[PDB]
Design a protein around this nucleic acid. Sequence first.
DNA 1: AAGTACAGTTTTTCTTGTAT
DNA 2: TATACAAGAAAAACTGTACT
Lengths: 63, 63
Amino acid sequence: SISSRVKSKRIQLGLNQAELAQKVGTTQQSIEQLENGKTKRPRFLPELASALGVSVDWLLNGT
Amino acid sequence: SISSRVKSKRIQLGLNQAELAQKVGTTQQSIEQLENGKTKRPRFLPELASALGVSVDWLLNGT
DNA sequence: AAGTACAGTTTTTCTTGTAT
DNA sequence: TATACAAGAAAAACTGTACT
């Protein structure tokens, strides 16, 4: 699950939704939509993975 | 641009818009847009880099 | 013909405001 | 202070059809 994956990586970077949104260059509301199953493929997918030290690949299919 | 990059490697791989469309899970129409510069951030980005045998970063950033 | 682009409509993601 | 809801705008998707 992408939402579960984001939520877990950010909680563990010890970031907040708004703090993350900042690094990713988006809004808190986008982070939530993502974290809450309202978005499958955000436009900020690349930056987000970059801001989580992960791979777009691990986010989408966690592999 | 990403457009540039996509169009090149498409041709370099000898693929047409519709056969890349099928490798990536999209429609040629969605391909023509990205290529023709309509679309800024295609959702199939990741599927695309795999198909074009490159990376998301080079695709969006080149280098 | 076969490959590419155009158009209208619809789905999805964003944005901004707010409520728990 | 942190996260969730929600209505409308916008990006971008689809289907169909038309260039070349």
